[PDB]
Short mmCIF file of N, CA, C and O in Angstrom, two decimals:
data_model
loop_
_atom_site.label_atom_id
_atom_site.label_comp_id
_atom_site.label_asym_id
_atom_site.label_seq_id
_atom_site.Cartn_x
_atom_site.Cartn_y
_atom_site.Cartn_z
N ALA N 1 173.84 -163.80 -72.64
CA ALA N 1 174.58 -164.17 -71.41
C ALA N 1 175.14 -166.06 -71.81
O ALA N 1 174.63 -166.32 -72.90
N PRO N 2 175.86 -166.07 -70.90
CA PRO N 2 176.48 -167.69 -70.94
C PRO N 2 175.27 -168.28 -71.10
O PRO N 2 174.36 -168.58 -70.67
N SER N 3 175.29 -170.13 -71.94
CA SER N 3 174.53 -170.85 -72.10
C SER N 3 174.43 -171.59 -70.75
O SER N 3 173.74 -172.54 -70.74
N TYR N 4 175.66 -171.77 -70.22
CA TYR N 4 176.05 -172.91 -69.07
C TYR N 4 175.36 -172.38 -68.02
O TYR N 4 174.85 -171.12 -67.75
N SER N 5 175.41 -173.16 -66.73
CA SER N 5 175.13 -172.88 -65.79
C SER N 5 175.60 -171.75 -65.28
O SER N 5 177.06 -171.97 -64.93
N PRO N 6 175.43 -171.07 -64.23
CA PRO N 6 176.08 -170.30 -62.77
C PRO N 6 176.34 -171.20 -61.93
O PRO N 6 175.63 -172.22 -61.90
N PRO N 7 177.64 -170.86 -61.30
CA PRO N 7 178.02 -171.95 -60.10
C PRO N 7 176.86 -171.58 -59.08
O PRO N 7 176.69 -170.16 -58.78
N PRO N 8 176.73 -172.68 -58.19
CA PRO N 8 176.05 -172.53 -57.05
C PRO N 8 176.51 -171.80 -55.69
O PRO N 8 177.59 -171.58 -55.93
N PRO N 9 175.78 -170.96 -55.28
CA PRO N 9 176.19 -170.03 -53.98
C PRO N 9 177.31 -171.10 -53.25
O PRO N 9 176.86 -172.06 -53.02
N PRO N 10 178.22 -170.64 -52.72
CA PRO N 10 179.07 -171.40 -52.06
C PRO N 10 178.48 -171.70 -50.43
O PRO N 10 178.03 -171.12 -49.78
N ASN U 1 167.90 -149.84 -58.87
CA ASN U 1 168.89 -150.73 -59.26
C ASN U 1 170.25 -151.14 -58.82
O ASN U 1 171.08 -151.39 -59.55
N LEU U 2 170.40 -150.24 -57.43
CA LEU U 2 171.44 -150.56 -56.80
C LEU U 2 171.62 -151.65 -56.21
O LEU U 2 170.72 -151.94 -55.08
N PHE U 3 172.83 -152.83 -56.09
CA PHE U 3 172.90 -154.21 -55.69
C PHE U 3 174.02 -154.26 -54.76
O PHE U 3 174.98 -153.47 -55.03
N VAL U 4 174.10 -155.30 -54.00
CA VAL U 4 175.50 -155.72 -53.35
C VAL U 4 175.75 -157.26 -53.62
O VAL U 4 175.10 -157.92 -53.50
N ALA U 5 176.87 -157.40 -53.95
CA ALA U 5 177.32 -158.63 -53.84
C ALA U 5 177.47 -159.72 -52.75
O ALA U 5 178.13 -159.03 -51.66
N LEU U 6 176.56 -160.87 -52.55
CA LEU U 6 176.59 -161.50 -51.43
C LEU U 6 177.97 -162.55 -51.31
O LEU U 6 178.25 -163.00 -50.17
N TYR U 7 178.47 -162.87 -52.22
CA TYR U 7 179.63 -164.12 -52.32
C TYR U 7 180.86 -163.62 -53.72
O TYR U 7 180.51 -162.77 -54.54
N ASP U 8 182.02 -164.20 -53.32
CA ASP U 8 182.71 -163.63 -54.60
C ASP U 8 182.41 -164.58 -55.67
O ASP U 8 182.17 -165.95 -55.75
N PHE U 9 182.53 -164.11 -56.80
CA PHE U 9 182.60 -164.74 -58.34
C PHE U 9 183.74 -164.34 -59.31
O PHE U 9 184.12 -163.36 -59.21
N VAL U 10 184.35 -165.65 -59.66
CA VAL U 10 185.70 -165.37 -60.43
C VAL U 10 184.97 -165.44 -62.01
O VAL U 10 184.44 -166.27 -62.24
N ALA U 11 185.41 -164.53 -62.80
CA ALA U 11 184.89 -164.45 -64.24
C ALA U 11 185.44 -165.64 -64.93
O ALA U 11 186.59 -166.22 -64.62
N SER U 12 184.98 -166.28 -65.79
CA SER U 12 185.18 -167.23 -66.66
C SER U 12 185.08 -167.22 -68.25
O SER U 12 184.97 -168.29 -68.74
N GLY U 13 185.28 -166.07 -68.98
CA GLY U 13 185.35 -166.11 -70.28
C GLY U 13 183.75 -165.66 -70.62
O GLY U 13 182.93 -165.35 -69.57
N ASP U 14 183.35 -165.80 -71.80
CA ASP U 14 182.07 -165.19 -72.21
C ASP U 14 181.51 -163.90 -71.59
O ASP U 14 179.99 -163.92 -71.33
N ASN U 15 182.26 -163.02 -71.51
CA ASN U 15 181.72 -161.75 -71.37
C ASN U 15 181.28 -161.46 -69.64
O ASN U 15 180.40 -160.99 -69.29
N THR U 16 181.92 -162.63 -68.72
CA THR U 16 181.40 -162.71 -67.33
C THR U 16 182.05 -161.54 -66.29
O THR U 16 183.31 -161.18 -67.20
N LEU U 17 181.51 -161.20 -65.49
CA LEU U 17 182.63 -160.06 -64.76
C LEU U 17 182.68 -160.69 -63.17
O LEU U 17 182.07 -161.32 -62.70
N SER U 18 183.95 -160.41 -62.56
CA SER U 18 184.52 -160.87 -61.33
C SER U 18 183.64 -160.04 -60.42
O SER U 18 183.98 -158.50 -60.47
N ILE U 19 183.32 -160.33 -59.46
CA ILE U 19 182.64 -159.62 -58.05
C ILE U 19 183.41 -159.91 -57.05
O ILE U 19 183.83 -161.29 -56.77
N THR U 20 183.34 -159.18 -56.13
CA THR U 20 183.85 -159.45 -54.63
C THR U 20 182.67 -159.02 -53.66
O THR U 20 181.99 -158.08 -53.87
N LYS U 21 182.79 -159.76 -52.37
CA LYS U 21 181.60 -160.26 -51.65
C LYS U 21 181.76 -158.62 -50.79
O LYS U 21 182.88 -158.03 -50.70
N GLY U 22 180.76 -157.89 -50.87
CA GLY U 22 180.95 -156.44 -50.30
C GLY U 22 180.58 -155.34 -51.46
O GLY U 22 180.37 -154.21 -51.14
N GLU U 23 180.84 -155.75 -52.78
CA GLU U 23 180.93 -154.76 -53.66
C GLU U 23 179.58 -154.06 -54.28
O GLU U 23 178.61 -155.35 -54.09
N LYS U 24 179.37 -152.79 -54.51
CA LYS U 24 178.05 -152.57 -54.87
C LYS U 24 177.92 -152.62 -56.42
O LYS U 24 179.21 -152.03 -57.19
N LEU U 25 176.93 -152.63 -57.03
CA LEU U 25 177.00 -152.86 -58.51
C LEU U 25 175.50 -152.36 -59.14
O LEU U 25 174.53 -152.69 -58.62
N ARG U 26 175.65 -151.84 -60.23
CA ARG U 26 174.46 -151.40 -60.82
C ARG U 26 174.05 -152.47 -61.87
O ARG U 26 174.90 -153.06 -62.61
N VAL U 27 172.49 -152.78 -62.17
CA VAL U 27 171.95 -153.99 -62.75
C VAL U 27 171.08 -153.32 -63.89
O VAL U 27 170.55 -152.63 -63.90
N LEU U 28 172.05 -153.74 -65.29
CA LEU U 28 171.17 -153.20 -66.49
C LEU U 28 170.23 -154.29 -66.91
O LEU U 28 169.09 -153.71 -67.63
N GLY U 29 170.02 -155.59 -66.60
CA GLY U 29 168.91 -156.58 -67.20
C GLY U 29 169.34 -157.59 -66.86
O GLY U 29 170.45 -158.03 -66.62
N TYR U 30 168.55 -158.47 -67.21
CA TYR U 30 168.67 -160.07 -66.96
C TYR U 30 168.53 -160.66 -68.40
O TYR U 30 168.09 -160.21 -69.29
N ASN U 31 168.97 -162.31 -68.27
CA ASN U 31 168.68 -163.04 -69.31
C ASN U 31 167.41 -163.63 -69.66
O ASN U 31 166.30 -163.46 -68.60
N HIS U 32 167.08 -164.66 -70.60
CA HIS U 32 165.43 -165.22 -70.64
C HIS U 32 165.16 -165.94 -69.76
O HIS U 32 164.04 -165.64 -68.94
N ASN U 33 166.12 -166.50 -68.79
CA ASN U 33 165.76 -167.66 -67.46
C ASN U 33 165.93 -167.05 -66.33
O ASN U 33 165.88 -167.53 -65.18
N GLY U 34 166.47 -165.60 -65.95
CA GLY U 34 166.73 -165.11 -64.86
C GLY U 34 168.03 -165.31 -64.02
O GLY U 34 168.54 -164.80 -63.11
N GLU U 35 168.66 -166.34 -64.62
CA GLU U 35 169.83 -167.15 -63.79
C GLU U 35 171.08 -166.28 -63.89
O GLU U 35 171.84 -166.20 -63.08
N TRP U 36 171.27 -165.14 -65.45
CA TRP U 36 172.26 -164.08 -65.08
C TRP U 36 171.94 -162.87 -65.36
O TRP U 36 170.68 -162.78 -65.94
N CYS U 37 172.72 -162.03 -64.54
CA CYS U 37 172.35 -160.74 -64.88
C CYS U 37 173.60 -159.67 -65.38
O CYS U 37 174.67 -159.79 -65.01
N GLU U 38 173.07 -158.65 -66.15
CA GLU U 38 174.26 -157.69 -66.67
C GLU U 38 174.49 -156.49 -65.58
O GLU U 38 173.45 -155.95 -65.23
N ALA U 39 175.93 -156.54 -65.10
CA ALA U 39 176.05 -155.70 -64.03
C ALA U 39 177.42 -154.71 -64.27
O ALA U 39 178.31 -155.01 -65.17
N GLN U 40 177.51 -153.53 -63.71
CA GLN U 40 178.34 -152.48 -63.97
C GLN U 40 178.93 -152.10 -62.58
O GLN U 40 178.36 -151.89 -61.62
N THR U 41 180.52 -152.20 -62.63
CA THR U 41 181.04 -152.30 -61.06
C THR U 41 182.03 -151.06 -61.47
O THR U 41 182.60 -150.63 -62.75
N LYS U 42 182.95 -151.04 -60.31
CA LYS U 42 184.42 -150.13 -60.73
C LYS U 42 185.45 -150.76 -61.32
O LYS U 42 186.22 -150.19 -61.87
N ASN U 43 185.10 -152.05 -61.56
CA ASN U 43 186.18 -153.02 -62.34
C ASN U 43 185.90 -153.14 -63.92
O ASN U 43 186.43 -153.54 -64.56
N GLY U 44 184.91 -153.08 -64.32
CA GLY U 44 184.13 -153.25 -65.54
C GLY U 44 182.70 -153.43 -65.78
O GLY U 44 181.77 -152.92 -64.70
N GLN U 45 182.34 -154.47 -66.67
CA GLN U 45 181.00 -154.66 -66.93
C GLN U 45 180.92 -156.22 -67.06
O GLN U 45 181.82 -156.93 -68.28
N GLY U 46 179.67 -156.84 -67.18
CA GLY U 46 179.37 -158.16 -67.65
C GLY U 46 178.66 -159.06 -66.95
O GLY U 46 177.74 -158.22 -65.88
N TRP U 47 178.27 -160.30 -67.20
CA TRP U 47 177.09 -161.04 -66.49
C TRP U 47 177.65 -161.72 -65.17
O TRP U 47 178.68 -162.08 -65.15
N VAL U 48 177.01 -161.66 -64.44
CA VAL U 48 177.40 -162.29 -62.83
C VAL U 48 175.99 -163.33 -62.51
O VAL U 48 174.72 -162.76 -63.09
N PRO U 49 175.96 -164.05 -61.71
CA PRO U 49 175.04 -164.95 -61.10
C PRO U 49 174.15 -163.93 -60.32
O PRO U 49 174.61 -163.20 -59.59
N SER U 50 172.82 -164.40 -60.82
CA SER U 50 171.27 -163.47 -60.19
C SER U 50 171.53 -163.96 -58.56
O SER U 50 171.22 -163.14 -57.81
N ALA U 51 171.76 -165.06 -58.41
CA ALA U 51 171.76 -165.62 -57.25
C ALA U 51 172.71 -165.28 -56.07
O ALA U 51 172.70 -165.30 -54.95
N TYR U 52 173.76 -164.33 -56.70
CA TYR U 52 175.08 -164.11 -55.92
C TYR U 52 175.03 -162.51 -55.31
O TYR U 52 175.66 -162.03 -54.74
N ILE U 53 173.47 -161.62 -55.71
CA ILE U 53 173.56 -160.40 -55.37
C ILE U 53 172.08 -160.01 -54.63
O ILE U 53 171.28 -160.87 -55.06
N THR U 54 171.75 -158.94 -54.13
CA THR U 54 170.64 -158.63 -53.25
C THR U 54 170.60 -157.27 -53.31
O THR U 54 171.63 -156.35 -53.39
N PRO U 55 169.26 -156.33 -53.49
CA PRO U 55 169.30 -154.82 -53.53
C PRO U 55 169.87 -154.53 -52.33
O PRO U 55 170.03 -154.76 -51.19
N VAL U 56 170.51 -153.00 -52.25
CA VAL U 56 170.89 -152.49 -51.54
C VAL U 56 169.58 -151.83 -50.34
O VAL U 56 169.02 -151.43 -51.17
N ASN U 57 169.96 -151.70 -49.08
CA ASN U 57 168.83 -150.86 -48.27
C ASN U 57 167.85 -151.71 -48.37
O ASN U 57 166.36 -150.91 -48.20
N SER U 58 167.42 -153.08 -48.13
CA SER U 58 166.63 -153.81 -47.96
C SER U 58 166.20 -154.73 -46.87
O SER U 58 167.50 -155.11 -46.46
#
């Protein structure tokens, strides 16, 4: 998976 | 392992998958920390945010 954070729920 | 998208998410590279609110998706697994999960839809396959989906029929 990506190492960065997923975006917060909008 | 059948789920529905709660919000829209647009893919950003790194094997991520775009999903549309209301779309159904099959879940194949999760990453080490649970934040990302591997999905398949009618548009393809890839990583989506775990917080963006919920089980169907619950």
